[PDB]
Amino acid sequence: TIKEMPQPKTFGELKNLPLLNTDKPVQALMKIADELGEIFKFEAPGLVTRYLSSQRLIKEACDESRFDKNLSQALKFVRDIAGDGLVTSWTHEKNWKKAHNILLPSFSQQAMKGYHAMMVDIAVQLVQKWERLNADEHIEVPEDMTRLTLDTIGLCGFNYRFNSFYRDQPHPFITSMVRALDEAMNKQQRANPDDPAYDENKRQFQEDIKVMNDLVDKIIADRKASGEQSDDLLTHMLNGKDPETGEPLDDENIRYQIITFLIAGHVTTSGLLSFALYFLVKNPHVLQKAAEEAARVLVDPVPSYKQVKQLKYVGMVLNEALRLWPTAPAFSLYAKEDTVLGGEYPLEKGDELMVLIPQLHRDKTIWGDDVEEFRPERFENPSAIPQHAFKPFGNGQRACIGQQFALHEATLVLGMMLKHFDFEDHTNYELDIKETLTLKPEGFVVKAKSKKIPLGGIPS
Template sequence: MRRYHPVMLEVAHELTHAWDRASGPVDVAADMTRLTLETIGRAGFGYRFGSFERAEPHPFVTAMIRALRFAQLQNVKLPFVRRAFAGSPAQNQADIATMNNLVDEVIEARRREGGESRDLLGLMLTEGHPMTGERLDPVNIRNQAITFVVAGHETTSGALSFALYYFTRNPDVLAKARAEVDAVWGDREPGFSDVAKLRYVRRVLDEAMRLWPTAPGYSREAREDVLLGGKYRMRKGDWVIVPLPLVHRDPAVWGPDPEKFDPDRFEPAAVKKRPAQAYKPFGTGERACIGRQFALHEAVLALGMVLQRYDFEADPAYELKIAESLTLKPSGFTVRPRARARAAVQTS
């Protein structure tokens, strides 16, 4: 994480440069996606998507979104609905080829360059199995890389977007978080160890992910016949989906007003009192998110930097709308960032 911090900081500065130049409202989810895509690309694979230099998304992103939507709609029985929202099978194959070709080019460029690199790509290319010494084959590395890029930016961008939405709707929370940033960071650029000191900002992020976990659920298969919860009979091989927005709103755990945004739910004493399975925004078990610490460091750093630098003007008439694809994000949410009078931090 110490190696990743400078990359995260570099990309966060690109976000603030873009917001400094903005003459009107900015699309929060779009810019958070630029931030997180650029961060995982550079930190994990040494690849620059040029996200803040483009008016339109990178072709990889366009292909990725369409391919994910195509996969999700495979259970829709009406072909014209699938084509309308996700394109044809031929388009899907072209999108997959676009993603594969880009990643193959990145891998081949790294092989030609040689040298030692300890990012994700470098480790996949050079490290072998601890017992057998066997290395990942090129197709496996490609698929792993695509998975890291997809999972490494979609969920974090949604969490950041929801956190900023709740900041604009809760002035007292915004003031408290900004006061923490001012007290801990002041006007200086944050170092690696400064990020974990923003404990209240982290609680805001946690509460945003409670209400809107951007990876909205996970599935489990019954290994044997079982009566689930003393109520639901499941046979071996049956599947159950755990919808996290409902789990995270269970009144038995979160109290009589689970819809209320309240970061104090994540004070240490409150966390200790809750069942461990009541809050699972990063999934659970062996398949829980491998990038959790990466995402949390990146998100708290980005939130701290925009709180340090900007006041936010949001449309008071905006009502939260959820865009659902592979992940959840707010749709149509914009803010007008205005430089704070005291914001005089280094910007490059």
């Protein structure tokens, strides 16, 4: 059967574009998806795309045989920041597979074990910051989580210490990065993007990128110092070669991968930890159960690699946080050839799709009517999940390469947090999600009372 696709309000020649005149576009698309269902067509000037919400359709979309990764109009703009790095590359581009085969070992199981000691190093610093707060002080959660995840990838991946916890205002890299990423997101709303009204937006974007590359200059210059016994993500960028081609990365592409992993390797993990702690203080019984698991397993002054993989409820808690609000909320696709989607929606070649991940994770077909509630107990048995129903890390060979890096870090930090502190919703925070392509709760503050359990490190 062939069915016609529902389409939201059209505003003449701008088509659907004025519908996204909000600083919360993903959440607006969720509102739309509620009123139109599993799929709807979205039209902008020059561009058309189809948003998906149902596990049924989306599981067909993840067929690598039928569909390859498309670059969103978002990603085409982020490409101005990250070039042809792993995230913003075409699959058919010759720098993807190259950098993929070169860098994939950096996220192997034996690689991950090397990162732990450094993950703890920055984790210790976060814990000790909260341990040293005075009585009348609030914890700006997403701000401290950003400090944590930036230093982690900065140290694990490049042996470079941002020293975020030694700073008042965010590191100049964070400031420029957000503005740069805010531009790409806000740029999607501009009929005539080259109208000189935006020449100011183009000038600040230039500055932001100048700052970020100045930091990359620091990282490269500091490695050639040296910089010797290191076998981290940066080492493989410089010395490693692609098997198929026998070629290393260029002068240019290397810089792009650094920018890529500095952004991608922290921004969504900052959001995950922020969302996770938010739900825990909004569901204290879940908080209790989780904090009880933390007290049970974390028996040494600092967690071991073995212990972090024993915290499965903490891992469950994070998955459930990734379910309700996937910090990387969407990824695009295109049909490799002509086909029909869901056996009822004909697709031409070159047609773009959008996997609306938050709406996907809300498919009542898979999780029940119990959707909007926060229950980590959904993930007690992973094999009970009709997969392609839970994809917070994308799909296929273009799925998140740092998925295990993220979850291990997050579980570790969240674990140490529960072991060492109790938490009170000090301001009774109503959830306010800020969009910057990625998702993150904004203005969310807490109070932390110390359980008087000391530390003692640090290995590496």
